[PDB]
Design a binder for this molecule. Sequence first.
Ligand SMILES: [Ca+2]
Ligand SMILES: [Ca+2]
Length: 88
Amino acid sequence: FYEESKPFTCLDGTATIPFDQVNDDYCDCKDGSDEPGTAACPNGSFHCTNTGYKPLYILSSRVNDGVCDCCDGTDEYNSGTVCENTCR
Ligand SMILES: [Ca+2]
Ligand SMILES: [Ca+2]
C-alpha cells in the first residue's frame, strides 16, 4: 500500500500543510487559501457557485454569519439561517 498524503501548499507559498488542515476551520495560510469554505481566515473568500447563474465571491467572514449573501444560499450551511434560492 502507498500512502498519498501529498500536502497542500498555500497559493502564496507561505506554508505547506496536510490536506486535513484545508477547510478545518483554522487559518493556516496568510492569503486564506486553505479555508475557502469556512469563516476562519480574515482575508479569505467564499465562492457562491450560483448554479445556472453568475457566480459571486464574498468575504469569508460572511460564511455562516446567519445572513443570506449568495443568491443560492450556500454561504449558510451550519448557522441556523436557512436561505432560499433567489438567483432568478
Ligand atoms: Ca486550516
Ligand atoms: Ca452569510
